[PDB]
Write a structure and sequence with these properties.
Chain A is mainly beta. Chain A contains no helices and three strands. The two termini of chain B are 46 Å apart. The radius of gyration of chain B is 26 Å and the shape is globular. In chain B, the strands form four sheets. Chain B has a six-stranded antiparallel β-sheet. In chain B, strands 12-16-15-14-13 form a five-stranded antiparallel β-sheet, with helices on one face. The chains are: A mainly beta, B alpha+beta, C mainly alpha, D alpha/beta. β3 of chain A pairs parallel with β1 of chain D, so a sheet runs across the interface. The structure holds adenosine monophosphate (2 copies). Chain C: Belongs to the protein kinase superfamily. CAMK Ser/Thr protein kinase family. SNF1 subfamily.
């Protein structure tokens, strides 16, 4: 019994992906349901932590970003 | 003879997931239904109480032209009866052997209808394992109807499945290798090998020796012989990609040139009386997708000059960082011994006064009480393995509706 | 009464603060 | 006239304006304010909800106006490094700027009407509007006049087209034509910010010596000073501070008094811009028709 191998789905970060320059700066591609709720983060620099997750509301998605000392 | 209401049961016609399926005949009008019989003497002996509960739950709210309807579910003190829609013609597995394969005209028509139902299932967060030509039935008018949902499972957001329950064939490589998956991609792979049998009359991955059969699967090799039209071969190689990330999606199939060929428009979304206005407003939303979704930028990185119209509200950030010129991590990763990690994460949890509960040696259910609004916020910690010497701690979020 | 999503972030930060070195 | 756009905005909720997938930036109040402004540039965003970690709630917005207010306020000019901005947290700056200017957070429910959204925008005179989920307490999106008029243009058949849409601006009397705040070509950036503070307008048309418009300095073009870190020399002109777009700006979007309201609206959503500069034959600026003015003429026909 070993801890399960990480599923490749979680290795698709919508924030690492870059959007089209013609699109609204706030828009993001449609995520699959399986990346939702999972926590993403930037490399800790200075003293500010940058956490991230994608959550759904009905049938609308929002990828919230938080800067925190 | 045992009757259910006015339905007298007759000819047994169902193998079942374990329980017999018979034909019901309305004693008053001869109306035919299909009844799945599950006596309490058998099911209770196992731990399949929630399994068939799961099957009924999924099928209860389904209503699609190419999925067998569940009309009712009647219980007696002895047995449970699933009353379903009856169709004559049996599996299309018997539509093969009979006839000579299928034409591009016919094999595609069935594939379209079958896929339409698969789509419908996934839209309702219901994956259907064991998706084989034996579970696809035909009515009098030779229309495909997806049937046995015994191995189905409801997809939950942020959660993978595993289990691995499909047939020896028709099962995706990530399933046979006992690896966790999202859901739909496993269904695509099963449909990918279905389309093969509809075009060839045989299986792409078969072997009498089973261990050597699972090898033939995980290796993405299969032969598309002679007559097989080039347009559909590109679809098969796509639907049967061993790498689940490069494997085709329903989106990728609907826009495929082979699948577009003469398909009925009534399949798929397009195409107190505000319902005729709420359905009209929705069409106007999907029409201008650029308003709701961010498109993908052009791929070529070898172009000398690239001309395009930039959004006015993203020019300063653009013109400064791009004129002559951070990654997001998933949770956290370490290289420590896996069980030594779990020992230290609980120390950190105990150090913050959190309520944790162990589900697996590498899976926790930690709970915190917000010291301001007195609200309980939950989250799940699952440990994974990335490299041959690197592990990943995953942070999931749990919503709770009361 | 507070954001459920931010609370989730707030919680994760407290954990990583200890774990991250 | 009265009642078709009103009915339309009263039938749809705020949830309909929300993109199927967007990005939202949230700052902790104990974050340094200069660090936050860079973060805006980082993600390519104008504003961010402010989370008071001590109170466990959202407390307001951090927009470009804050950046303008920081700069105009603490501008020891100019070679001495700006000290009150380097060492200054958000919460500590809301203890200074927000005081004697207290604008409490105004949000709206996703299930709330689109009408009340436009109503809230005008009644509160704010360009942003955080669509906040009442349960969970999550912010879903930040509503704007731009987003509303676009959706309006998008989701309506002009078969029941009203009268005033085919009528000119001169007769409709929409827009501001008295005391137009504007800057000269040579006007220092700092002076422009001072105008932004006392007049509280979204943009300042750049005029020549003849009083003719040749460019426009919107509040949005201020983060360029934060994007290029050229925020320490405010002595420079507006036209030099707008050089970063240069040849890639295709001209200032104008309009005339004699062209229909529909003409103005259509032109305004294709441009994805907040306001149009009303102008005569000789390009002399004579007025400004903003999204604020237009949406006001739709809630109140
Ligand atoms: N530079 C300006 N000078 C005078 N009035 C303006 C200016 N910019 C906007 N306005 C008016 O102020 C109101 C709000 O504009 P805005 O801040 O663009 O939403 C509207 O009535 C505009 O016509
Ligand atoms: N009348 C106009 N003509 C040309 N560009 C404009 C005009 N108004 C605003 N912009 C630009 O549009 C972008 C967004 O500003 P805003 O109009 O405040 O949304 C900025 O780059 C402005 O400089």
């Amino acid at each position: 019994k070993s801890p399960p191998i990480l599923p490749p789905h979680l290795l698709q970060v919508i924030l690492n992906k870059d959007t089209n320059i013609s699109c609204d700066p706030a828009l993001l591609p449609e995520p699959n349901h399986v990346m939702l709720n999972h926590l993403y983060a930037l490399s800790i620099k200075d003293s500010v932590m940058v956490l991230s997750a994608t959550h759904r509301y009905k049938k609308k998605y929002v990828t919230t970003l938080l800067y925190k000392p | 003879r045992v009757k259910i209401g006015h339905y007298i049961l007759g000819d047994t016609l169902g193998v079942g997931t374990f329980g017999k399926v018979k034909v019901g005949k309305h004693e008053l009008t001869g109306h035919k239904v299909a009844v799945k019989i599950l006596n309490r003497q058998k099911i209770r002996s196992l731990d399949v109480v929630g399994k068939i509960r799961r099957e009924i739950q999924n099928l209860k709210l389904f209503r699609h032209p190419h999925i067998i309807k569940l009309y009712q579910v009647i219980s007696t003190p002895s047995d449970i009866f699933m009353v379903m829609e009856y169709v004559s013609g049996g599996e299309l597995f018997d539509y093969i052997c009979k006839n000579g394969r299928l034409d591009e005209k016919e094999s595609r028509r069935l594939f379209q209808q079958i896929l339409s139902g698969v789509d419908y299932c996934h839209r309702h967060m219901v994956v259907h394992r064991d998706l084989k030509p034996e579970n696809v039935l035909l009515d009098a008018h030779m229309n495909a109807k997806i049937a046995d949902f015994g191995l189905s499972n409801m997809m939950s957001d942020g959660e993978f499945l595993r289990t691995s329950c499909g047939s020896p064939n028709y099962a995706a490589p990530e399933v046979i290798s006992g690896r966790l998956y999202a859901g739909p991609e496993v269904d695509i792979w099963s449909s990918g090998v279905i389309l093969y049998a509809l075009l060839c009359g045989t299986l792409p991955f078969d072997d009498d020796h089973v261990p050597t059969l699972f090898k033939k699967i995980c290796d993405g090799i299969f032969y598309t012989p002679q007559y097989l039209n080039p347009s559909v071969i590109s679809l098969l190689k796509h639907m049967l990609q061993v790498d689940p990330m490069k494997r085709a999606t329903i989106k990728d199939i609907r826009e495929h040139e082979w699948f577009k060929q003469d398909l009925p428009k009534y399949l798929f979304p397009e195409d107190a009386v505000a319902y005729h206005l709420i359905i009209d407003n929705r069409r106007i939303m999907n029409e201008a997708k650029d308003f709701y979704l961010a498109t993908s930028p052009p791929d070529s990185f070898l172009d000398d000059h690239h001309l395009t119209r930039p959004h006015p509200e993203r020019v300063p950030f653009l013109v400064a960082e791009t004129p002559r010129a951070a990654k997001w991590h998933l949770g956290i990763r370490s290289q420590s011994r896996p069980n030594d990690i779990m020992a230290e994460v609980c120390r950190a949890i105990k150090q913050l006064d959190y309520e944790w509960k162990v589900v697996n040696p590498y899976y926790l259910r930690v709970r915190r009480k917000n010291p301001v609004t007195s609200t309980f916020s939950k989250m799940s910690l699952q440990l994974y393995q990335v490299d041959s010497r690197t592990y990943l701690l995953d942070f999931r979020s749990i919503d709770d509706e009361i | 009464p507070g954001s459920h999503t931010i609370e989730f972030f707030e919680m994760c930060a407290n954990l990583i603060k200890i774990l991250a070195q | 006239n009265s009642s078709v756009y009103t009915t339309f905005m009263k039938s749809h909720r705020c949830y309909d304006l929300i993109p199927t997938s967007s990005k939202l930036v949230v700052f902790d109040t104990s974050l340094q304010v200069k660090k936050a402004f860079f973060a805006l540039v980082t993600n390519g965003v104008r504003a961010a909800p402010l989370w008071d970690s001590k109170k466990q709630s959202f407390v307001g917005m951090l927009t470009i106006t804050d950046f303008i207010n920081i700069l105009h306020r603490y501008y020891k000019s100019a070679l001495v490094q700006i000290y009150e901005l380097e060492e200054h947290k958000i919460e500590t700056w809301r203890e200074v700027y927000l005081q004697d200017s207290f604008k409490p957070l105004v949000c709206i429910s996703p299930n709330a009407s689109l009408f009340d959204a436009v109503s809230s925008l005008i009644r509160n005179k704010i360009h942003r509007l955080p669509v906040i989920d009442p349960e969970s307490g999550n912010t879903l999106y930040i509503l704007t006049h731009k987003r509303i008029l676009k959706f309006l243009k998008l989701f309506i058949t002009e078969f029941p087209k009203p009268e005033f849409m085919s009528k000119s601006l001169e007769e409709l009397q929409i827009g501001t034509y008295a005391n137009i705040a504007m800057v000269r070509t040579t006007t220092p950036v700092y002076v422009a910010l001072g105008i932004f503070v006392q007049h509280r307008v979204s943009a300042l048309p750049v005029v020549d010596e003849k009083g003719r418009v040749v460019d426009i300095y919107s509040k949005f073009d201020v983060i360029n000073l934060a994007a290029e870190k050229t925020y320490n020399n405010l002595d420079v002109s507006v036209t030099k501070a707008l050089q970063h777009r240069s040849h890639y700006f295709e001209g200032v979007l104008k309009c005339y008094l004699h062209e229909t309201l529909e003409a103005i609206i259509n032109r305004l959503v294709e441009a994805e811009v907040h306001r149009l500069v009303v102008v005569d034959e000789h390009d002399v600026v004579k007025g400004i028709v903003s999204l604020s003015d237009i949406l006001q003429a739709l809630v109140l026909t």
